[PDB]
Write a protein that binds this ligand. Structure first.
Ligand code: SF4
Lengths: 72, 69
């Protein structure tokens, strides 16, 4: 199981759920993506998020708007 | 249970209305899930709003940062 190797397990979970407050949380999305960029299971995380339809949050180095644009 | 602790942690990140919606939906507070209609009456929210609250909450629960492996 790839979740054993998730490095976000050592982070504040809310980092991966930025709230747009009168605008895109560009800085917080970037801060979450920086974690994903040093994660060994990024492709597995993204694959699972896409295949199960996780609509909220940053998964696998992609923001929710990016994943949403991927699926129509 | 670790599920219990993580569930309460996730609920703390929500607004009071959103957390109440989730608790009535899953029956976490008194053991009785409520229908979407009663949740709507109680919190003045639409079926669609309930669905998006639930989707966001489930995403938070299933995110690998909180994972109970
Ligand atoms: S890719 Fe990002 S969200 Fe997925 S497990 Fe790795 S750090 Fe966590």
């Amino acid at each position: 199981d790839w979740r054993h190797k998730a490095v976000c397990r050592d982070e504040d979970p809310e980092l991966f759920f930025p709230v747009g407050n009168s605008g895109p949380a560009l800085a917080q999305i970037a801060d979450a993506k920086l974690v994903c960029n040093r994660c060994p299971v990024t492709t597995e995380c993204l694959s699972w998020a896409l295949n199960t339809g996780q609509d909220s949050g940053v998964w696998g180095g992609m923001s929710e708007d990016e994943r949403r644009a991927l699926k129509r | 249970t670790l599920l219990q602790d993580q569930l309460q942690s996730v609920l703390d990140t929500l607004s009071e209305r959103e957390a109440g919606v989730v608790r009535l939906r899953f029956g976490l507070t008194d053991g009785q899930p409520r229908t979407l209609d009663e949740i709507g009456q109680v919190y003045g929210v639409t079926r669609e709003r309930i669905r998006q609250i639930e989707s966001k909450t489930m995403s938070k629960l299933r995110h690998p940062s909180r994972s109970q492996v």
